[PDB]
C-alpha cells in the first residue's frame, strides 16, 4: 500500500490558500490522518479520519476525501503554518505515510549579509585550513555560492548547509565552508566567497588575502 503526496514543496504568500493531495493505491475508506512538523519539533496530528479536526487546531485546516483520494486544505496561510506535512494511512499493515510536503512562506526579497572568515591559527596548527563564509537573512532560498582561489573557481572540499526557514522573519541563512590542507592554503593569496542571488544582477563578493 503506497501513499503518494503532492506537491512535494509549496511556496505560499500569507493570506493565500493551498491544498495538499494524498493518494492511496487501494481504497482506505476514511482511515487517513494528517500531521504537521515544524523544525526541531516532532509531528503533530492536524486532522484525523480524513475530516475530523483535533482540539486546538485552526479551522483554516480542513481535511477531505474518501477511498483513494484525500485533501488537506489550508485557508489564508499564516507565517506560523510553515513546515512539513504528512498524510498517514491506518487501513492496512504496515501503516504508511506519504512522502510529505514542505510548506514554505513567501515574503519580501531579502539580500544576504555575507561575512568571510580565514582559518584560525588553532586549525592551521593541526595541519588543516577552512575558509568559512556565512550568508544570513536572505529570501528566496535559492542562492548560488562559489569559491575563488586566486581567481580560479573551486568546488573540491566545499560544504554547504542551509538553515530551515526562520519562524520570526521567514528568511534563510546558509554556511559555506571551503576546506583545504594547510600547505595548499599557503600556496595561494586571495580567497573569495561569491554569492549570486535574485536581489542583485551582480554577485556579492567577500574577500580575504592571506598576504594581508
Amino acid at each position: 500500500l503506497v501513499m503518494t503526496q503532492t506537491p512535494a514543496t509549496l511556496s505560499v504568500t500569507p493570506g493565500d490558500s493551498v491544498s495538499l493531495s494524498c493518494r492511496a493505491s487501494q481504497s482506505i475508506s476514511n482511515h487517513l490522518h494528517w500531521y504537521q512538523q515544524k523544525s526541531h519539533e516532532s509531528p503533530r496530528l492536524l486532522i484525523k479520519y480524513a475530516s475530523q479536526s483535533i482540539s486546538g487546531i485552526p479551522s483554516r485546516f480542513s481535511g477531505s476525501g474518501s477511498g483513494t483520494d484525500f485533501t488537506l486544505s489550508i485557508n489564508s496561510v499564516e507565517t506560523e503554518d510553515f513546515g512539513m506535512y504528512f498524510c498517514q494511512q491506518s487501513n492496512s499493515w504496515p501503516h504508511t505515510f506519504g512522502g510529505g510536503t514542505k510548506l514554505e512562506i513567501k515574503r519580501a526579497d531579502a539580500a544576504p549579509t555575507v561575512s568571510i572568515f580565514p582559518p584560525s591559527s588553532e586549525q592551521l596548527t593541526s595541519g588543516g585550513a577552512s575558509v568559512v563564509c556565512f550568508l544570513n537573512n536572505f529570501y528566496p532560498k535559492d542562492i548560488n555560492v562559489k569559491w575563488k582561489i586566486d581567481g580560479s573557481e573551486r568546488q573540491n572540499g566545499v560544504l554547504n548547509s542551509w538553515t530551515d526557514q526562520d519562524s520570526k522573519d521567514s528568511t534563510y541563512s546558509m554556511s559555506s565552508t571551503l576546506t583545504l590542507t594547510k600547505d595548499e592554503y599557503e600556496r595561494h593569496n586571495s580567497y573569495t566567497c561569491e554569492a549570486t542571488h535574485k536581489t542583485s544582477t551582480s554577485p556579492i563578493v567577500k574577500s580575504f588575502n592571506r598576504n594581508e
Binding site: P94, F97, E122, V132, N136, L159, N160, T163, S173
Partner: protein, 214 residues
C-alpha cells in the same frame, strides 16, 4: 497533560543491538496502544512497531520483523523497543507515540539512533573572527570532525540569544561539521567577550571557545 519521553538512542556498530525506552505520564498508560515511528535522514516517516493497550497484540513493519521487539511495562508506564541485527537502514530519529485509534495523537521529542562502523569522535572547535567597520560584527565557530550527531551550540552559555544562527551538520567521510554564527554590536566586541560553547554528549565533551581579534 500527556508526556512522552524516549531515551536510549546512540551510536551502534552494524549487526549490533540497542534498547530504546519511552517513559509516559499524564494519562492512563494501560488504556492506550503505543507505537514507535522513525524519521529517516530523507525526512520520511516510517511506522516501525505497535503494541496493544494490554500488550497482547504486537505489529511490526516487515523490514523490521524478527530483529525488533516492542514491549511495555504498564506498571512502570514505560514502553520499550529492543533492536538487534542493526543495519544502516535503521539510522533514524525514533519517536514513541500514543494512539487515537489509527492516528498517532501524541508524540515524544525523539531519540537519535546511529548505525555505523565509524567511531565516536569529539569536535575540534575553531574560532571564526573577522580578518584585520560596520555597526554590527559577525563571529562564529566551526565545530569540525564529530561523530555521531548531535552537538549543541550556545553563545556566552545561553546569555547571547539574538543574532545566533546554528547551521545543520553536514556529513563528510564519517565526520560531521557544523558552524554557528553570532552578530553582535561592533562597539561591544572585543570590549565584551564572546565565547561559543559546544556540547557533544556522545563523547561527554564540552568545549568553551573564546573569540579573539586576529
Amino acid at each position: 497533560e500527556v508526556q512522552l519521553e524516549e531515551s536510549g538512542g546512540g551510536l551502534v556498530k552494524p549487526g549490533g543491538s540497542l534498547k530504546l525506552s519511552c517513559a509516559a505520564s499524564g494519562f492512563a498508560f494501560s488504556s492506550y496502544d503505543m507505537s514507535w515511528v522513525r524519521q529517516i535522514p530523507e525526512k520520511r516517516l516510517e511506522w516501525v512497531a505497535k503494541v496493544s493497550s494490554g500488550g497482547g497484540s504486537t505489529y511490526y513493519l516487515d523490514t523490521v520483523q524478527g530483529r525488533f521487539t516492542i514491549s511495555r511495562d504498564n506498571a512502570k508506564n514505560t514502553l520499550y523497543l529492543q533492536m538487534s541485527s542493526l543495519n544502516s537502514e535503521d539510522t533514524a530519529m525514533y519517536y514513541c507515540a500514543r494512539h487515537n485509534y489509527g492516528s498517532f495523537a501524541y508524540w515524544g521529542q525523539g531519540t537519535l539512533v546511529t548505525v555505523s562502523a565509524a567511531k565516536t569522535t569529539p569536535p575540534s572547535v575553531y574560532p571564526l573572527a573577522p580578518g584585520s567597520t560596520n555597526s554590527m560584527v559577525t563571529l562564529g565557530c566551526l565545530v569540525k570532525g564529530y561523530f555521531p550527531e548531535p552537538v549543541t551550540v550556545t553563545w556566552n552559555s545561553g546569555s547571547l540569544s539574538s543574532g545566533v544562527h546554528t547551521f545543520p551538520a553536514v556529513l563528510q567521510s564519517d565526520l560531521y561539521t557544523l558552524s554557528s554564527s553570532v552578530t553582535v554590536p561592533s562597539s561591544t566586541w572585543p570590549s565584551e567577550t564572546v565565547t561559543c560553547n559546544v556540547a557533544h554528549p556522545a563523547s561527554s565533551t564540552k568545549v568553551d571557545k573564546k573569540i579573539v581579534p586576529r
